[PDB]
Amino acid sequence: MNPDDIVVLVGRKKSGKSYLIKHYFIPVLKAHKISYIIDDHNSEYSKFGYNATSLSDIVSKQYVVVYDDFFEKLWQASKLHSKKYGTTVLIIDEAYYHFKYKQKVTPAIDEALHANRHAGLGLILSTQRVYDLMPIVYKQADLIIMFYTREPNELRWISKYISAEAAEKVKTLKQYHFLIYDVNSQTIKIHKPIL
Ligand SMILES: [Cl-]
Ligand SMILES: [Mg+2]
Numbered sequence: 215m216n217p218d219d220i221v222v223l224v225g226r227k228k229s230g231k232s233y234l235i236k237h238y239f240i241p242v243l244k245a246h247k248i249s250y251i252i253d254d255h256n257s258e259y260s261k262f263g264y265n266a267t268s269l270s271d272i273v274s275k276q277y278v279v280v281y282d283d284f285f286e287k288l289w290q291a292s293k294l295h296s297k298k299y300g301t302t303v304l305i306i307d308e309a310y311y312h313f314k315y316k317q318k319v320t321p322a323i324d325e326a327l328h329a330n331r332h333a334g335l336g337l338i339l340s341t342q343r344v345y346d347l348m349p350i351v352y353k354q355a356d357l358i359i360m361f362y363t364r365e366p367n368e369l370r371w372i373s374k375y376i377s378a379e380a381a382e383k384v385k386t387l388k389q390y391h392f393l394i395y396d397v398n399s400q401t402i403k404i405h406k407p408i409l
Pocket of ligand 2: 231
């Protein structure tokens with residue numbers, strides 16, 4: 215993950231999405247001195263950054279958790295954060311609320327999908343089913359990560375918007391194993407569980 219990449223995480227609850235964030239993305243971000251802002255809508259990430267009580271905290275604290283009209287506020291605050299700390303990763307553990315399939319696209323959502331680099335903000339979006347998010351999220355993504363599924367509608371979406379090969383290989387992943395799809399290079403890795 216480049217610091218201004220868009221990364222999508224896809225898998226049913228308990229498949230290991232938050233674990234990957236906590237144990238794979240966050241530590242590597244930290245090691246490069248890459249800032250992040252975690253937008254938690256379900257706390258679970260309490261120990262990974264300053265727990266914010268205001269928009270000012272989002273801007274000023276280097277590693278920050280936010281407990282979530284609001285997306286535009288969050289987005290504006292993140293842009294100001296990035297100007298202070300350099301490229302920042304905005305991590306959203308419930309992309310289902312702002313990026314939902316068949317929803318409109320505000321200027322801020324559009325910016326987040328098409329103008330990341332310019333705003334100095336990477337994105338990690340997390341979702342339980344592939345068909346929860348707008349197909350344009352899959353087109354705009356740089357890396358798509360998928361855990362096991364054989365739900366036939368999900369296979370169809372993966373095949374149509376991502377890769378027919380990924381749709382095949384997704385069906386055989388063991389627990390905590392995950393497929394990585396590089397949208398740009400069009401390659402596929404099958405990764406073992408994180409330690
Ligand atoms: Cl709008
Ligand atoms: Mg989770």
